[PDB]
Coordinates of C-alpha atoms in Angstrom, one line a residue:
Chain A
X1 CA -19.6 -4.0 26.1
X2 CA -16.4 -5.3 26.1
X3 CA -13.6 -3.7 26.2
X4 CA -9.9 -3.3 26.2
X5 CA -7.3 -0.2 26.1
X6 CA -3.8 -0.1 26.2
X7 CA -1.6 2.7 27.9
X8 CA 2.1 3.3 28.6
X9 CA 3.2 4.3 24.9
X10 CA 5.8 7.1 23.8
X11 CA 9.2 8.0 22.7
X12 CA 11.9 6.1 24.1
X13 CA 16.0 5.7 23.4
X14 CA 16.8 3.0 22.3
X15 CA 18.4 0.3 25.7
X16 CA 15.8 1.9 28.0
X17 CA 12.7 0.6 29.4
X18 CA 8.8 1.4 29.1
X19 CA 5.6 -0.3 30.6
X20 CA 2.5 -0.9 28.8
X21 CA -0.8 -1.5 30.8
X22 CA -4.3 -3.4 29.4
X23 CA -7.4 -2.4 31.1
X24 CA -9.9 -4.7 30.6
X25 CA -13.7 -4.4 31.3
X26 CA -16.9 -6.0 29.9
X27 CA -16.5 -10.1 30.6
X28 CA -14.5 -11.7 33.4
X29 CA -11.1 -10.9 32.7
X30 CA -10.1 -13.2 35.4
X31 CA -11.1 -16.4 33.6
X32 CA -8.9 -15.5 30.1
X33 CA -5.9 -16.1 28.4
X34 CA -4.7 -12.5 26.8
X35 CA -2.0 -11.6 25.0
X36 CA 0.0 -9.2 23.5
X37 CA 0.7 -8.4 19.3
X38 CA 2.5 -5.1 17.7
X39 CA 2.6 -3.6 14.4
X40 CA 5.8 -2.0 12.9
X41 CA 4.5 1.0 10.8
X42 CA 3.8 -0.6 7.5
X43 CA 4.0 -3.9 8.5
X44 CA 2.1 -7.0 9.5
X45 CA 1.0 -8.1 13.2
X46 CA 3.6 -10.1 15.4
X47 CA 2.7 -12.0 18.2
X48 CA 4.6 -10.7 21.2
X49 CA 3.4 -12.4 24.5
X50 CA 0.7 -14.3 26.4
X51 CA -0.2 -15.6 29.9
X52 CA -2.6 -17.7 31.0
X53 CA -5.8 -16.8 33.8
X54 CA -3.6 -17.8 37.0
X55 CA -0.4 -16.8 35.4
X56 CA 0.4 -20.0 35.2
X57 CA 1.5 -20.6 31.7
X58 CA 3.8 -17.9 29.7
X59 CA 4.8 -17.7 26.3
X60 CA 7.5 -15.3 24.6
X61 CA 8.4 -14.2 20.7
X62 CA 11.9 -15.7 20.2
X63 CA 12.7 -11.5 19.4
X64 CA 11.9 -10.5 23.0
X65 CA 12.6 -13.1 25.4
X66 CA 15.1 -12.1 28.2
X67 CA 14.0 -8.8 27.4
X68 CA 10.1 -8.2 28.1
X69 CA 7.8 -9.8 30.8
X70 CA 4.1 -10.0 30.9
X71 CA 2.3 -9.8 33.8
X72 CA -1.6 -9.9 34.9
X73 CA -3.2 -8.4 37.9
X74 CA -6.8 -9.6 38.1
X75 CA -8.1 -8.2 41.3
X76 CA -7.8 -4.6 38.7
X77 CA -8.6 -6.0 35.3
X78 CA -4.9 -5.3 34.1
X79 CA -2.4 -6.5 31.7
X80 CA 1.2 -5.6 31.8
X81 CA 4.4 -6.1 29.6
X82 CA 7.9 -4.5 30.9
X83 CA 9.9 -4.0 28.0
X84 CA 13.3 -4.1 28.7
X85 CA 16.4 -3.4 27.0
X86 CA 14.6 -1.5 23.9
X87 CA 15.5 -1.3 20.3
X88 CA 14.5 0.5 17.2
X89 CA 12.9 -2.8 15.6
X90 CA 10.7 -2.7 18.7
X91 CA 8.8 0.2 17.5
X92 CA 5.5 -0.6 16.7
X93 CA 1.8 -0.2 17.9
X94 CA 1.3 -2.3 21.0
X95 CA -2.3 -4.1 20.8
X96 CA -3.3 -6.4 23.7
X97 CA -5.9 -8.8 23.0
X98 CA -8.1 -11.2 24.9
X99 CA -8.4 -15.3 24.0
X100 CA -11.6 -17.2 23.7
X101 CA -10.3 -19.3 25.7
X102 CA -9.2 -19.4 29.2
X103 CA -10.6 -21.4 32.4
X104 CA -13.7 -23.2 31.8
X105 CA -13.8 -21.8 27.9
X106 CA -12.0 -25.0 25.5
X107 CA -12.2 -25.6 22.2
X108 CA -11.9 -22.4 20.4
X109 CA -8.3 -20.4 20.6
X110 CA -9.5 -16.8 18.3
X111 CA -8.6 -13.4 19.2
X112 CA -12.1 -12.1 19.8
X113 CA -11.5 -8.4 21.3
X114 CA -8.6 -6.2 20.4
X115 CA -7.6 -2.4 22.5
X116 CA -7.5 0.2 19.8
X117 CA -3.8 -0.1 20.6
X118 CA -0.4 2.5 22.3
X119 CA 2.5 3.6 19.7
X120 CA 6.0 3.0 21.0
X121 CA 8.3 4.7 19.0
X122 CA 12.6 3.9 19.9
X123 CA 14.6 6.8 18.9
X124 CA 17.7 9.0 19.5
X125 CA 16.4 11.3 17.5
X126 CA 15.4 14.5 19.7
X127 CA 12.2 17.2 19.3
X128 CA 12.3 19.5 16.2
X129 CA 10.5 21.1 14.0
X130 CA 10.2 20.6 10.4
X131 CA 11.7 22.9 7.7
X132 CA 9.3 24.3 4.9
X133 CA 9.8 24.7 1.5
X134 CA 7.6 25.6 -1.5
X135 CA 7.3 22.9 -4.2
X136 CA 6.5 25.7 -6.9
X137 CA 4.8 24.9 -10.3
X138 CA -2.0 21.9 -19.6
X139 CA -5.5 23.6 -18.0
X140 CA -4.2 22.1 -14.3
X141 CA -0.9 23.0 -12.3
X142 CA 0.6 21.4 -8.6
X143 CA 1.9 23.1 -6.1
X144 CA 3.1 22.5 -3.1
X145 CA 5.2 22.3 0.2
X146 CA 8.0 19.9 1.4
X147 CA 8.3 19.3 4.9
X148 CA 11.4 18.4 6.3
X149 CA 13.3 17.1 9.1
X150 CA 10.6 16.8 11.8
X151 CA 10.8 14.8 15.0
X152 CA 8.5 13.0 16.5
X153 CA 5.0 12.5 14.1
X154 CA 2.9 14.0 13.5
X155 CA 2.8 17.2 11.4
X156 CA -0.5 18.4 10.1
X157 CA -0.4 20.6 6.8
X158 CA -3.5 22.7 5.5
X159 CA -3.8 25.2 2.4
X160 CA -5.0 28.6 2.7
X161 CA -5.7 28.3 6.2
X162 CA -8.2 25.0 5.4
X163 CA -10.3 26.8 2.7
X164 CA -8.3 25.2 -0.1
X165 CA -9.0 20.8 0.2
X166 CA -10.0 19.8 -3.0
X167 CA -6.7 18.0 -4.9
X168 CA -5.1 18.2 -2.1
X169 CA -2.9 15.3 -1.0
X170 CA -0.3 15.0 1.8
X171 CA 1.8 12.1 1.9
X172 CA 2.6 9.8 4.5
X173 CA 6.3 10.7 6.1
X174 CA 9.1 8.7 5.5
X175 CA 11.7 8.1 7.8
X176 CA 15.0 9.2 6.6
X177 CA 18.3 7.5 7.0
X178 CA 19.2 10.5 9.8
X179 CA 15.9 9.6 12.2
X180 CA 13.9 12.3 11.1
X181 CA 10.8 12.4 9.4
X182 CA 9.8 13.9 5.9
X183 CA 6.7 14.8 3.9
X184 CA 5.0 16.8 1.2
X185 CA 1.9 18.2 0.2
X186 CA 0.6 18.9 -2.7
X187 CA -2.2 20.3 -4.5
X188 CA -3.6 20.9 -8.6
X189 CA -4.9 23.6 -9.0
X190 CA -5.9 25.6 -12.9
X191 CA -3.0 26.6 -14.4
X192 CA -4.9 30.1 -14.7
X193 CA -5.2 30.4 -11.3
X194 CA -1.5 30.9 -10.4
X195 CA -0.9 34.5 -11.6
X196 CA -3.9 35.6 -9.8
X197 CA -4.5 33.5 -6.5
X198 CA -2.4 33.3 -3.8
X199 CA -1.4 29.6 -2.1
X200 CA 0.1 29.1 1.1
X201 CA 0.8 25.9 3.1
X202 CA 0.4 26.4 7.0
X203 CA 2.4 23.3 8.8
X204 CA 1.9 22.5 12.5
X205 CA 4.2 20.3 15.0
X206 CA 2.7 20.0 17.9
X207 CA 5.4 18.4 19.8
X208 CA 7.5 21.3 19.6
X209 CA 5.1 24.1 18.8
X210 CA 6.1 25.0 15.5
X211 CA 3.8 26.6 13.2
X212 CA 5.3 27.8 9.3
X213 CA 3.2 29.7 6.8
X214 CA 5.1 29.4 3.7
X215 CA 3.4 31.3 0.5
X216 CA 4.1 28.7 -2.8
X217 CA 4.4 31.1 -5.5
X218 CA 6.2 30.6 -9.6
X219 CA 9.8 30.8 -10.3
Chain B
X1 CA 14.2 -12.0 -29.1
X2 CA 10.4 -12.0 -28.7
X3 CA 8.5 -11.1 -32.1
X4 CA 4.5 -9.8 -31.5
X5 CA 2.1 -10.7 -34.3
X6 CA -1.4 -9.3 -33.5
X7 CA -4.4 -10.9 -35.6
X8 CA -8.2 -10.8 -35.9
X9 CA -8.8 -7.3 -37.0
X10 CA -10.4 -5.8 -40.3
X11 CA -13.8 -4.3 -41.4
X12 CA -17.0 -5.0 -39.1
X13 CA -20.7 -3.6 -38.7
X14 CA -21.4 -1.8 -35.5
X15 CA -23.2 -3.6 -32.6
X16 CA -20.4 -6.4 -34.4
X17 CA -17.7 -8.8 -32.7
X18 CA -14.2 -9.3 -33.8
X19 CA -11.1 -11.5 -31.9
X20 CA -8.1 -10.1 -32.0
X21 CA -4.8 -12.3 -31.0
X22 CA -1.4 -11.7 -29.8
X23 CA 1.1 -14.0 -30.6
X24 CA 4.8 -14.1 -29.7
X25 CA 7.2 -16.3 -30.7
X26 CA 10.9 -16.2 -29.8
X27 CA 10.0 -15.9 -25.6
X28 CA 8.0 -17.5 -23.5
X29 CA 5.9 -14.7 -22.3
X30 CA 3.8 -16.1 -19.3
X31 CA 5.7 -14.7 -16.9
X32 CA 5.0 -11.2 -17.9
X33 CA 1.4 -8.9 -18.5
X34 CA 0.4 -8.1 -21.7
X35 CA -1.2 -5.0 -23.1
X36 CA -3.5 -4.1 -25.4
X37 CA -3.2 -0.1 -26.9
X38 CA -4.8 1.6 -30.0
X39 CA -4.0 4.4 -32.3
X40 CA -6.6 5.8 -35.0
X41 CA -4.4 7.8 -37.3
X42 CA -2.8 11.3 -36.6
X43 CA -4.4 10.7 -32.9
X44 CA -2.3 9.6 -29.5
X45 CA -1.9 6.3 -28.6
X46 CA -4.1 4.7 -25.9
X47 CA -4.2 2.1 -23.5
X48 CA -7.0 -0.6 -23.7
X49 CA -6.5 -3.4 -21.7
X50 CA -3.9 -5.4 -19.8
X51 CA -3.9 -9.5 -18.8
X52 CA -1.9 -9.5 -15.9
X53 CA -0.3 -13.3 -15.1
X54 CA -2.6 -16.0 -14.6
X55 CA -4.1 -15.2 -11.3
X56 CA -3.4 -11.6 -11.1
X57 CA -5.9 -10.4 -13.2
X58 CA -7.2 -8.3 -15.6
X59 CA -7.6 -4.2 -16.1
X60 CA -9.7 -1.9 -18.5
X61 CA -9.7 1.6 -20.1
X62 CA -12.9 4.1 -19.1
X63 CA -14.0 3.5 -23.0
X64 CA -13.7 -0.2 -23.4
X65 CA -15.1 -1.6 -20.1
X66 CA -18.1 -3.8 -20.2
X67 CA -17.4 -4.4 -24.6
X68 CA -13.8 -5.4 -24.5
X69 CA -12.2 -8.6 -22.6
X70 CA -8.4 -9.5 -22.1
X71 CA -7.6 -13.2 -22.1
X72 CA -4.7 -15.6 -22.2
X73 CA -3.5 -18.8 -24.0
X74 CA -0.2 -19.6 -22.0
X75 CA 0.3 -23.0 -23.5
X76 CA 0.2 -21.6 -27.0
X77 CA 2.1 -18.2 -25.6
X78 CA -0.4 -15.8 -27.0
X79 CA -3.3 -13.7 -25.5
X80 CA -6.2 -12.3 -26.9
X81 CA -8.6 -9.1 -27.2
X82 CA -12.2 -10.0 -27.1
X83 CA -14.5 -7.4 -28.4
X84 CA -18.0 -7.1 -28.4
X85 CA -20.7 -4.1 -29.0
X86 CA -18.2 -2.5 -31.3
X87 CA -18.8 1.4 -32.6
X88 CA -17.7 3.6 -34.8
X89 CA -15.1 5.5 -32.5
X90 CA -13.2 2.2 -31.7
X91 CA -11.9 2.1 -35.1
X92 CA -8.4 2.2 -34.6
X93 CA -4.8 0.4 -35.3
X94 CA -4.3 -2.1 -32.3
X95 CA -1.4 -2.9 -31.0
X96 CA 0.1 -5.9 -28.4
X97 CA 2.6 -5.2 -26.0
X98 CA 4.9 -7.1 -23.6
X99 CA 5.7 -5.3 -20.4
X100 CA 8.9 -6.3 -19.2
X101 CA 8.6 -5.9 -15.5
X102 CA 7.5 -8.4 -13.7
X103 CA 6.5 -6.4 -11.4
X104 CA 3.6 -4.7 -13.9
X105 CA 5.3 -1.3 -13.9
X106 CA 4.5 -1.0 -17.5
X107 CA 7.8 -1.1 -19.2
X108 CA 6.6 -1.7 -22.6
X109 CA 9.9 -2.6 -24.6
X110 CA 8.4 -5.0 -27.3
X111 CA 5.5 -4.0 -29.6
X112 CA 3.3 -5.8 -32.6
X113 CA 3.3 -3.9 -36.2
X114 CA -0.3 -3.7 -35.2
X115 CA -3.8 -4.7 -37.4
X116 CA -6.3 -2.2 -38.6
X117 CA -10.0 -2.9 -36.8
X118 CA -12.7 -0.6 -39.0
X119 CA -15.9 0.0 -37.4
X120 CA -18.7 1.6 -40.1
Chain C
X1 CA 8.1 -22.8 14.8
X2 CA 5.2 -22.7 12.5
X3 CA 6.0 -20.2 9.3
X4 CA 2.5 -19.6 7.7
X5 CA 2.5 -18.0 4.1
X6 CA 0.2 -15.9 3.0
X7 CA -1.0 -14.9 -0.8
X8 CA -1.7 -12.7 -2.7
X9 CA -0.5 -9.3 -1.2
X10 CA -2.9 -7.1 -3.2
X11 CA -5.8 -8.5 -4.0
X12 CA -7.5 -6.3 -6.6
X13 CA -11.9 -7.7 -7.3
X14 CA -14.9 -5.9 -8.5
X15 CA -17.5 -5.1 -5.4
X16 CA -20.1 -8.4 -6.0
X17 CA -16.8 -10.6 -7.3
X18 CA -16.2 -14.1 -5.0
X19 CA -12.4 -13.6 -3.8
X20 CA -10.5 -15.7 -2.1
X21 CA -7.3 -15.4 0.5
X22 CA -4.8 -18.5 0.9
X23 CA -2.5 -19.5 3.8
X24 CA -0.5 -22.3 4.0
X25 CA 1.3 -23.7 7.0
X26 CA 4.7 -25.1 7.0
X27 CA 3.6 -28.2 9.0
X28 CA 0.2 -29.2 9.8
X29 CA -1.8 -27.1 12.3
X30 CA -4.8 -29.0 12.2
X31 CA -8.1 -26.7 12.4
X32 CA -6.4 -24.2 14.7
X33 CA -6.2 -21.4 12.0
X34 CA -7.7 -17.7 12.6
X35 CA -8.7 -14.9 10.5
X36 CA -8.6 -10.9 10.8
X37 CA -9.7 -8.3 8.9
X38 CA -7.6 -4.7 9.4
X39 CA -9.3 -1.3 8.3
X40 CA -6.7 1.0 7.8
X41 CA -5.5 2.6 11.1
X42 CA -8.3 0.2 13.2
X43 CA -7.5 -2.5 15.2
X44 CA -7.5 -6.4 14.0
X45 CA -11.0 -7.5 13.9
X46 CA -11.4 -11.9 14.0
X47 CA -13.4 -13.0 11.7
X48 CA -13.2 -17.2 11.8
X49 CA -11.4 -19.5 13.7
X50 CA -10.7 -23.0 14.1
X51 CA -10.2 -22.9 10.3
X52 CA -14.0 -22.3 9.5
X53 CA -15.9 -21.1 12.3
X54 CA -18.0 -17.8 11.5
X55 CA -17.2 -15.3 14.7
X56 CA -20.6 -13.7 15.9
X57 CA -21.6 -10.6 14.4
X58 CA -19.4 -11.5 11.1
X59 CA -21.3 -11.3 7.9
X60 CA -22.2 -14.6 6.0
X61 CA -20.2 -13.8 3.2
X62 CA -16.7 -14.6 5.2
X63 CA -16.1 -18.3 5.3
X64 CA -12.9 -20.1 5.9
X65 CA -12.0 -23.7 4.8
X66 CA -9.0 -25.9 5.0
X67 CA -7.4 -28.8 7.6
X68 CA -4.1 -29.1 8.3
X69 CA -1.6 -27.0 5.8
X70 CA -3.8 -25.1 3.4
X71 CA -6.2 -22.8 4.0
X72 CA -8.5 -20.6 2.4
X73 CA -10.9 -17.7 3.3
X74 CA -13.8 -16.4 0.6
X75 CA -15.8 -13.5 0.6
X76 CA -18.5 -15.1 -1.6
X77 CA -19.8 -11.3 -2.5
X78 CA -16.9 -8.5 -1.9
X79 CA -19.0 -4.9 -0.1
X80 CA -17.4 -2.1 -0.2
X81 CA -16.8 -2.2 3.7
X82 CA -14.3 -5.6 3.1
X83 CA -11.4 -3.3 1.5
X84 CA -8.7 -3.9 4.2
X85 CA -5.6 -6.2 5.4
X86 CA -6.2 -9.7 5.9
X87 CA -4.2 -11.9 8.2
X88 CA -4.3 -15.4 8.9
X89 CA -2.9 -16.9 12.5
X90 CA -2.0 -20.0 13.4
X91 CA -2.6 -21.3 17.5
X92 CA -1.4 -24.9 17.9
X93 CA 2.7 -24.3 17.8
X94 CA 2.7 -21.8 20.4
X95 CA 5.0 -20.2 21.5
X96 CA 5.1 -18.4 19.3
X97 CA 2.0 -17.8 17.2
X98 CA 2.3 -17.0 14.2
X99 CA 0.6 -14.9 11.5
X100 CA 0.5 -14.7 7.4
X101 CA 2.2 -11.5 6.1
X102 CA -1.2 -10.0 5.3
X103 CA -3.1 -9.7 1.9
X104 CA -4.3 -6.1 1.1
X105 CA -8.0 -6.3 -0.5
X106 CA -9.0 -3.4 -2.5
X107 CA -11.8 -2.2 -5.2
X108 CA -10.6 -2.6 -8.9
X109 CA -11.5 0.4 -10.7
X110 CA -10.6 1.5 -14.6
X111 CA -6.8 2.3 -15.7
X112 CA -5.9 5.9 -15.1
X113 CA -2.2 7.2 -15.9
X114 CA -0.4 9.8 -13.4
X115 CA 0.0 12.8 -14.2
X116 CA 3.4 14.0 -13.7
X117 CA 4.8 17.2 -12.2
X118 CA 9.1 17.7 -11.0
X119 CA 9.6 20.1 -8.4
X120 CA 13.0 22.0 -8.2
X121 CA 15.0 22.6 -4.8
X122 CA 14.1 26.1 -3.5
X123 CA 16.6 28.6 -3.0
X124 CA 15.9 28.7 0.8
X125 CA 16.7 24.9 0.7
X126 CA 19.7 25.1 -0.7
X127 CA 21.5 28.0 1.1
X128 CA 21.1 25.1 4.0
X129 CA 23.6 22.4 2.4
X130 CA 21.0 19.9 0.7
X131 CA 18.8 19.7 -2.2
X132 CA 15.4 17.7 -2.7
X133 CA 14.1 17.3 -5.9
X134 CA 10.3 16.5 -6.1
X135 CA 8.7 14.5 -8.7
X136 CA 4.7 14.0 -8.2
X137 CA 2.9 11.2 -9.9
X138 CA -0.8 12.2 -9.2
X139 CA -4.3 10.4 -9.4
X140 CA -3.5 6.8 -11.0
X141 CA -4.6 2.9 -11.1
X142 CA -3.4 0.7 -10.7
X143 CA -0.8 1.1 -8.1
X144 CA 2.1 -0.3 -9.7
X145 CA 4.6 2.9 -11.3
X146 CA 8.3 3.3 -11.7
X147 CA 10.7 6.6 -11.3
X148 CA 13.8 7.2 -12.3
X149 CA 15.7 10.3 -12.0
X150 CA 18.0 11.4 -14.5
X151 CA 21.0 14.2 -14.0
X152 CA 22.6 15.4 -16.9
X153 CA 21.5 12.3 -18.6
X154 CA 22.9 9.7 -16.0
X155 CA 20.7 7.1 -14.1
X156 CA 20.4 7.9 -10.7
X157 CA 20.6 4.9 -7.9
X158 CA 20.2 4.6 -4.2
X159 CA 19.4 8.5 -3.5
X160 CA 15.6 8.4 -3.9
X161 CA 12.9 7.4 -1.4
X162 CA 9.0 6.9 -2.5
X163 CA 5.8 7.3 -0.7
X164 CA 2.1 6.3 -1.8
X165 CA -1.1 7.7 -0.8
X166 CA -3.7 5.8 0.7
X167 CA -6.3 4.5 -2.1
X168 CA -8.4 7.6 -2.8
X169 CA -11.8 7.1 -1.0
X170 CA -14.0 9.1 -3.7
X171 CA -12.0 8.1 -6.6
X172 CA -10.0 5.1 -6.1
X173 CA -6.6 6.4 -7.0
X174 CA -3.1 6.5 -5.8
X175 CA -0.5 9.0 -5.8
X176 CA 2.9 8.9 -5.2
X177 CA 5.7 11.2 -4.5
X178 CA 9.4 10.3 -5.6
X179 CA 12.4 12.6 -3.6
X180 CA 15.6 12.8 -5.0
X181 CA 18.1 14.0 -2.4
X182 CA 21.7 15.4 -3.6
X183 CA 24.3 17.8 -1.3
X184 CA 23.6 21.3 -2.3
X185 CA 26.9 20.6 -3.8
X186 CA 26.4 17.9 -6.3
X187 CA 23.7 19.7 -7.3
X188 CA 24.6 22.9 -8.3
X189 CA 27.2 20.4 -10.5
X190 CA 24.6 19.5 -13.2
X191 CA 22.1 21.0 -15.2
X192 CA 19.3 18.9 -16.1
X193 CA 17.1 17.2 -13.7
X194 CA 14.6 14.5 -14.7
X195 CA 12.1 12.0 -13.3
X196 CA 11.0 9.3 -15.7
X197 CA 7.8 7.7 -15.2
X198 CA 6.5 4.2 -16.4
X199 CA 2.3 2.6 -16.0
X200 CA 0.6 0.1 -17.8
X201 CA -1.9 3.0 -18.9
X202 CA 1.0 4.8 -20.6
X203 CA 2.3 3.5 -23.6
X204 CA 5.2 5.6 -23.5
X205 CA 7.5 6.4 -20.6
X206 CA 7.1 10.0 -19.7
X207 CA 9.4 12.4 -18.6
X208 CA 9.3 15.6 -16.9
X209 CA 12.3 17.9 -16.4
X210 CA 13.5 21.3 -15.8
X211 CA 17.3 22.9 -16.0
X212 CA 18.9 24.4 -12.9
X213 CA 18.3 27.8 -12.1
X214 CA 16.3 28.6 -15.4

């Protein structure tokens, strides 16, 4: 089928440089225009970057020119873009797509395959793990767990090990003013259940191998 | 400032149709969604409906959807309550409200005296 | 450049319902207008282009219209499978391309007001030098709410940040959680903490609150 993926993501501080690579495979990458797009998290798509089959024709957002360059290799299916000079407005999901059109192919200028896209996240932020604290609490009571200060995404949270899901909802982070991410969980729960069932949150961060168990329990 | 005068109510058979309206006078009010809420006595309030600004639409409580419809008159600065298939449990006092965020928060600041709709 | 503007941003129809997304160009662009559809977290998926060409493998019920600076794309008969971002893309100023800033699409469903739960600081937060105060606002519809936090009676500004779940898949609801953040100091100044909660299904404001250390 066709196909496209995108590689080369990760953390990077902010005035350093990262390369992202499209593989293509499926139709004749040789013979199309492709180009690059991002995503800020939360945001709408932004055309980045394009070049033509022979490279022959090259096209830049007014926010990166100067500082990115796209490249193509077609003898290995490739797309490139060097991304220089890095800032935090820069991070974004990276998607490269391929044109309808290209040589011999006129007349219609879609998008018509997309990769499944690389994050690239500019930061000066270093690796740490979050801090956990309990949120503690009609027929139906919340509970929960706030976690705190985490770098980079993602944490996971479950509840009693992954036997408690139902009403359970764990918000998106936020990124806080200090570079660090934030998020709680919560869960209802009957209001009869708290003096006689016991509720803890278990957080993992991978990236630095922190794992919390933090029992949520009344005042 | 604005004044709410809601309309339209009194007795009616069930399976019956009554209009209620919602007229304000001392503000233009097409810039803002108006609510429809109801209280039958010594019970809490509730929310019926809400008529969001032309073009944004219209929202419904669990017990009136598929009877009741919200409806505007911008020209003549007044919405309506349609209400059709009408039983004994909507008997109620109804009540028109401004919400005075734009941006449909619901902060209800202005509110009619209310009419009486009897269903039996 | 091309600026293309893009309305509504939430889009709120009944599955069956006709809809319709607009995007109008600053200058004329001719035909060459895209569309794409955007699942949460999947990639952009082109649904017409030159302005009102069907992509292959695209269901019937997307069509696009429009020449020049206003466009439109229906879905004559919303599915379940359409809720998702829609952008529209303009081709013939280039570079750079441009896109609309995106309509969300989602299933209407009946009015249901949050339920409301404040969360203190826990001790083990505060020994640490700052203070998050958690107010929940739990299973509601439509998506629109307002918090405010109250100390000791004053109006809070500028020290709260908000975040919003994903519409529910089984039951169509949002929830949202407000944080308050204070120094451990400035809290331990005041007594009562409150977060103040406003939706069209309540017809009251409602506020929940708790008093420090009790």
């Amino acid at each position: 089928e066709v196909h496209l993926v995108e590689s080369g993501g990760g953390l990077v501080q902010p005035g350093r440089s990262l390369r992202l690579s499209c593989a293509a495979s499926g139709f004749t990458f040789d013979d199309y225009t492709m180009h690059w797009v991002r995503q800020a998290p939360g945001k709408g798509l932004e055309w980045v970057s394009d070049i033509s089959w022979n490279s022959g024709s090259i096209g830049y957002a007014d926010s990166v020119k100067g500082r990115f360059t796209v490249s193509r290799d077609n003898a290995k299916n490739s797309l490139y873009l060097q991304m220089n000079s890095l800032r935090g407005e820069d991070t974004a999901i990276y998607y490269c797509a391929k044109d309808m059109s290209g040589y011999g192919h006129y007349g219609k200028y879609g998008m018509d395959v997309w990769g499944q896209g690389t994050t690239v996240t500019v930061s000066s932020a270093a690796t740490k793990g979050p801090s956990v604290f309990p949120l503690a609490p009609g027929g139906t009571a919340a509970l929960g767990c706030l976690v705190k200060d985490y770098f980079p995404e993602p944490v996971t949270v479950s509840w009693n090990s992954g036997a408690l899901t139902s009403g359970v909802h764990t918000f998106p982070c936020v990124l806080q003013s200090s570079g660090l991410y934030s998020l709680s969980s919560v869960v209802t729960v009957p209001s009869s259940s708290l003096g006689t069932q016991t509720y803890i949150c278990n957080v993992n961060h991978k990236p630095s191998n922190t794992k919390v168990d933090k029992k949520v329990e009344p005042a | 400032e604005v004044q709410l005068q809601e309309s339209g109510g009194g007795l009616v058979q069930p399976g019956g149709s009554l209009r209620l309206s919602c007229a304000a006078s001392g503000r233009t009010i097409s810039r803002y969604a108006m609510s429809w809420f109801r209280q039958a006595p010594g019970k809490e309030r509730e929310f019926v409906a809400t008529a969001r600004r032309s073009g944004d639409g219209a929202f419904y409580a669990d017990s009136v959807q598929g009877r009741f419809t919200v409806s505007r008159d911008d020209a003549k600065n007044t919405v309506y309550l349609q209400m059709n298939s009408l039983k004994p449990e909507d008997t109620a006092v109804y009540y028109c409200a401004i919400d005075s965020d734009t941006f449909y928060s619901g902060s209800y600041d202005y509110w009619g005296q209310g009419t009486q709709v009897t269903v039996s | 450049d091309i600026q293309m503007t893009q309305s509504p941003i939430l889009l709120s129809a009944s599955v069956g319902d006709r809809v319709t997304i607009t995007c109008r160009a600053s200058q004329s662009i001719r035909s060459y207008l895209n569309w794409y559809q955007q699942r949460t977290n999947g990639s952009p998926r082109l649904l017409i282009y030159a302005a009102s060409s069907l992509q292959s493998g695209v269901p019937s019920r997307f069509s696009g219209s429009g020449s020049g600076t206003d466009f439109t794309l229906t879905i004559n008969s919303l599915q379940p499978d359409d809720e998702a971002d829609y952008y529209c893309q303009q081709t013939y100023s280039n570079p750079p391309i441009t896109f609309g800033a995106g309509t969300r699409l989602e299933i209407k469903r009946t009015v249901a007001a949050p339920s409301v739960f404040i969360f203190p600081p826990s001790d083990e937060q505060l020994k640490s030098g700052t203070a998050s105060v958690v107010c929940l606002l739990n299973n509601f519809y439509p998506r629109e709410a307002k918090v405010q936090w109250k100390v000791d009676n004053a109006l809070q500004s500028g020290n709260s940040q908000e975040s919003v779940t994903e519409q529910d898949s089984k039951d169509s609801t949002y929830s949202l959680s407000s944080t308050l953040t204070l120094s451990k100091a400035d809290y331990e100044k005041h007594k009562v903490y409150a977060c103040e909660v406003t939706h069209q299904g309540l017809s009251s404001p409602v506020t929940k609150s708790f008093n420090r250390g009790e």
